[PDB]
Design a protein around this ligand. Structure first.
Ligand code: NAI
Ligand code: NAI
Lengths: 278, 301
């Protein structure tokens, strides 16, 4: 069956252009009731709404800053009586070599990207819980996953978003609230990522807590792997940095690495290590 | 040969107790000139006192080492480095360890609950590190430690603010690793497990007393030693065990075909492939990621 969002209210932030607008247009065309938001920095959002209405879809605009998150969800509620999907897309760039990053260059990036997504997602959270339905998208970036010269501020905010999502996955799974994160990328058409966002935000999708790099027509998934590592301490004998150095190769050897999935498992391993030594 | 830090100046933020304290004592015992910083407040973000830092500096002195205290909040990062510059004249290593908790279920995290965690953990580390950056570049040497956590890596109920800040620190380090390379400035991240005032509520009491901060100090000392070459690593450490983490990426799927609109249904149809990790690759750079997307265009056309 073709992917429809009929009756689903979808809030997209920073949807005045690029990726956002492309999601706004992709969603509405499949029956979604879209709340198009964009700080317009008011004509930015209005233009996309128009495109949607003209296309035979339904939508309304919101002109507030994601910093004013509560307001973006209010527009979804006051206009459609609910909120099902939140795509956190709003973002800006303030690239500088690390030493030249001013306090403001840092703060503004955290405010729009991270604090913005926290405010908006927090405003919709209880509504999603009470109704037992929610699909959330966080927009990370390769610069966050890998790092990238001149983007210390941006890379920290993007991975911070992943951290936020990891927890939301835990707190929301019981109420059918899914949260996934993407790292998207002239020829790199925004319509090449939109389909992944639509799938990840569909009611038939069961993916929760995934991290995805998207671009050019390709999609890949990322996860952590951890080395079996080494116990470099013996009971009654103080642990030394020399033991760490002398076991460095083993500690860093990824052969048969585990694929850790929760904090419990990690904590459980540490407690078992303590028991083996004792 | 035993690892020493003679002639090295080490700044440890939040060295008044727990992990920070164990690090400062270990460094000082090995010859390092240590600036022990601590705001002297509680683990919830309320308070200020000079005794936290003063006691550690006293313990170090009694053990025959040399240290000086700094009482500023990491939020005033630049001042910690100044204490290092004014007292010893250089700054070789920065261990960003200062931290607090403000646990609440997501819906109940207030704006201040969020902002204060970010200010101290992330913004504070950025401030302290940024203040030492040019000094390390001039010295053509530097060792930096960011303290993340398992809750940031895996997520953890009631800590959305904390977990975002902690992985946020990792994204900061990812970049510092690239920018500090030519100047021998290494930056590594750790996710420690040690019993402290900050962990009682998530650890049976006896487990608290048994998971010593002294079991993680050894790793921190090695990663900050001149002879260590590790740069940009992420390590989980506790009880005497150490392990390393890294990303693995699926080979994935090209769901788009030449002149044929890409659809959501196509993505759904290639889901098993997209999520299969057999022969996954181990990506390490944004350039290789960008090179890859560009190769996808070529393969398709
Ligand atoms: N296009 C690409 O290659 C990549 C994009 N990304 C991320 O994708 C997202 C959007 O990317 P693009 O469309 O390419 O960029 P963009 O800059 O065109 O889109 C951001 C949108 O955010 C809106 N905005 C800015 N501040 C706002 C605020 N305070 N409140 C509400 N809206 C606000 C802007 O008006 C703009 O339309 C961002 O989060 C960006 O970091 C990440 C990696 C690569
Ligand atoms: N112990 C554990 O199992 C884990 C610890 N961590 C992290 O390790 C670090 C240290 O944790 P613990 O030693 O266990 O806790 P702790 O509470 O004993 O030590 C933290 C120290 O930071 C100081 N501090 C707080 N806010 C400060 C500020 N603004 N400026 C300067 N100093 C400040 C406190 O006074 C305290 O001495 C933190 O960043 C924590 O989030 C992360 C995961 C697990």
């Amino acid at each position: 069956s073709p992917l429809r969002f009929d009756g689903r209210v979808v809030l997209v932030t920073g949807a005045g252009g690029g990726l956002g607008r492309a999601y706004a247009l992709a969603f509405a065309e499949r029956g979604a009731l879209v709340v198009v938001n964009d700080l317009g920095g008011s004509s930015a959002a209005d233009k996309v709404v128009e495109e949607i209405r003209r296309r035979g879809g339904k939508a309304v605009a919101n002109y507030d800053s994601v910093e004013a998150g509560e307001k973006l969800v209010k527009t979804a509620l006051d206009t459609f009586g609910r909120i099902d999907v939140v795509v956190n897309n709003a973002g800006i760039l303030r690239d500088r070599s690390f030493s030249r990053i001013s306090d403001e260059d840092w703060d503004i990036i955290q405010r729009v990207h991270l604090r913005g997504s926290f405010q908006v997602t927090r405003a919709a959270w209880d509504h999603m819980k009470k109704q037992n339905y929610g699909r959330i998208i966080m927009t990370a970036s390769a610069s966050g996953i890998y790092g990238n010269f001149g983007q210390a501020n941006y890379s920290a905010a993007k991975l911070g978003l992943l951290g936020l999502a990891n927890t939301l996955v835990i707190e929301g799974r019981k109420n059918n609230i899914h949260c996934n994160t993407i790292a998207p990328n002239e020829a790199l058409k925004p319509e090449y990522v939109a389909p992944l966002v639509l799938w990840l935000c569909h009611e038939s999708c069961e993916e929760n807590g995934g991290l995805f790099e998207v671009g050019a027509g390709w999609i890949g998934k990322l996860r952590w792997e951890r080395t079996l590592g080494a116990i470099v301490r013996k009971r009654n004998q103080p642990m030394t940095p020399e033991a760490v150095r002398d076991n460095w190769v083993k500690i860093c050897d990824f052969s048969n690495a585990s694929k850790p999935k929760s904090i419990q498992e990690s904590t459980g391993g540490i407690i078992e290590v303590l028991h083996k030594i004792d």
